[PDB]
Amino acid sequence: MAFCIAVIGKDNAPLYLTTSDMEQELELQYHVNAALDVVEEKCLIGKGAPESKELYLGLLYSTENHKIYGFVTNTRVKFIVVIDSSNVALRENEVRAIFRNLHLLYTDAICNPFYIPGESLTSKKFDRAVQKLMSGTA
Amino acid sequence: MTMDATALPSELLVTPQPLVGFCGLDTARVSVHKAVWEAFSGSLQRKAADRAAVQYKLLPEWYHPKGILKRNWMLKHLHVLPSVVVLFQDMEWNDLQWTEKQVQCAAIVQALKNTLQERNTRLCLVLLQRAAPLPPGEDLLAAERAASLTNACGITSKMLFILPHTEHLTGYALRLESAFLDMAQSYYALMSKRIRNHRDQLTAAHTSLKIRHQFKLGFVAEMRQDFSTGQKHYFQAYANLDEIRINDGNCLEIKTLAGFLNYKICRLMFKLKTPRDAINQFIIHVEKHKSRVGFKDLAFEHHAWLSTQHSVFAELFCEAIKNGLPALQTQHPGIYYHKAAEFVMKRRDAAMEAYAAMQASSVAEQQANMQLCDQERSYNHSAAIIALLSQAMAQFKIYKCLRFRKKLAIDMAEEYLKSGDHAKALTLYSLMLPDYRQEKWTTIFTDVLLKTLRCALLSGSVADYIACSVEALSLRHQSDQSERILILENLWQVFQGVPPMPKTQLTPEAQALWTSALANVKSVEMCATFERVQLSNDDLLQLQLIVRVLTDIPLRIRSFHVILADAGNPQSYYQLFCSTEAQQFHENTQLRIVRLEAHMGTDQVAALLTCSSN
């Protein structure tokens, strides 16, 4: 149940840790997972990947053992976790709740005045926020 | 019974169509018959619907079924037995020639029907006329002709036809098309009657015969444009295939039958504008078949078939596009191309260890496995990966996709490296760096960069080598420091001609490559700082640009040049004495730097991070 967390800026990715419930993501797709995203954009973007809505993307992108669920804000930020489970008994409702949680944690890291927006997430606090998310919902 | 139902790969991949044949003829009769033949092919010229679907062959323990027992009987059912046969001569009333042609045409059609009876194809008689049209009801000798010829062979009067000149020959060839269609369809319905009356009986639960019957009737329905009864029969045959639980390692014949009927059902769906049905079918089938095999699994198995299966399904997609079904494309255009590609990569890998196990030692059927090993050695070409990714890339571009084409392109380049043809790989990588640099995904960028350097060093393309090396220098903080140092010293070496030290990493051939080069090859992030742009009437400017070095390991301080910008008139930090500008020119003057001309340690950067204006 690997949640490759990836916040994206306008184009580039501020934070994309490789963590889950149990321990780190061994699988060596990381930089090319971001490359999955650069095909989720410039391809699976359509006219749609950016919107003006709190974005429910139930499986905007899918593949074996790797299922992308997306979100976008008016500030053009791309919020994406991946369902790395061919299937587990978790239904999209808790996924919506998880994007609520991720929204809030990201924007509360945003609450820092020191951290300039669009840079690598320095906050070990926003880290542990993401980390609790992964340890809980993976 | 124990033999395979059917063994034909790519059976009737072409659209099945009605097929009428007739006896081979010499060049001069066919020379008169030319106009008739291109009248036939005018349907090819005209639109396909206006074309009659028919085609022209032009030839010279229950008991087992007739015509259905064999796969070769089956292949015969395809084309070897046209459902219509027409004997071609000219109808020409004469005095003695008339009688001669009567006797000969009667005898030849006699032999022809002797041939055609068992195969049940009816033999329609159509004869050419170049003479003036005959008014029906005027010639009683024509009546006698009809009587004699009809009683010559039992072919009825209505079957007899006349071939007029082109202005009429066009419409009469068309009505001939219609009659041939009708009698072929009557034949096919009869043949299906045969099938069904066979089907009522059973050989005590073999059901392979049942599959053959459904598949034969699939021929029939597909042939008759029914498109439906055949697909139902295919469904039922596949189901009864399933109820046959796998006895033993002979899963391959099952999987081949599955692939056959799977193509059939999917394409028949696509004919019927049922894309969702086809998608669900193919997925269901492919994961069923993934779950199918447990052993042997000689790594020939499950790889080649799966790749081919994806290949065929993308081909069906393209067929659909030709038809015009964009519902499946708007979701994903080239779905299974690169799945097939990854499967053929897996196949090459499987071949690697198949070799390895073959080196282990090598009493029954083992020699067959040996020839298997050799045949898949023939398959070690793996350019099929290249072709599959080619199609995948094109199709991805079809729906405005850049990265999947970009990532499969990196897969192409890496397999080129495995191909050894590093030249094409470096060509690809050369195209692929800019987009990654714009994309800013700092993870992937260096990850492809190290491979791109590998290609540059193997190729000896020292120009690209130094350019990618200096861009790596500019921000090389992710990698280890000593490696940055080695890169820099190798760079200085090659600017002044010295080969790089990883000699064990290099090979004598590549040594020749880059020793040969540099005959044409000629000519860390820092900032340009101009104290005074928009010059006035009198001033001076010295070294104010500040050469910051992002790299840890210092750039060696020997020399440097700046080329005086032509804007207007032609003319740990290190701050030094260079200080080029010391003269006077016209005012309102601005400056802008093309490249560093970085003669600090190296000769010049060759990569444009020498920003003009920040």
UniProtKB/TrEMBL annotation, chain A:
Alphabetical list of InterPro entries matching this protein:
Longin-like_dom_sf (IPR011012), Sedlin (IPR006722), TRAPPC2L (IPR044760)
The record's Gene Ontology cellular component field reads:
cytoplasm; nucleus; perinuclear region of cytoplasm; TRAPP complex; TRAPPII protein complex; TRAPPIII protein complex
Check the record and name the Pfam families matching this protein: Sedlin_N
Q: Which UniProt keywords apply?
A: ER-Golgi transport, Transport
One Gene Ontology biological process: Golgi vesicle transport
Q: Where in the cell is it found?
A: Cytoplasm, Perinuclear region
Gene3D superfamilies listed in its UniProt record: 3.30.450.70
The family annotation for this protein states:
Belongs to the TRAPP small subunits family. Sedlin subfamily.
Q: What name does UniProt use for this protein?
A: Trafficking protein particle complex subunit 2-like protein
From TrEMBL, chain B:
Q: Where in the cell is it found?
A: Golgi apparatus, cis-Golgi network
Trafficking protein particle complex subunit domain residues: 250-474
Residue ranges of the TM segments: none
Q: Describe the family membership recorded for this protein in Swiss-Prot or TrEMBL.
A: Belongs to the TRAPPC11 family.
Described purpose of this protein according to its UniProt entry: Involved in endoplasmic reticulum to Golgi apparatus trafficking at a very early stage.
| Record's protein name | Trafficking protein particle complex subunit 11
Query: Which species is the source of this protein?
Result: Drosophila melanogaster
Recite the lineage of the species.
Eukaryota, Metazoa, Ecdysozoa, Arthropoda, Hexapoda
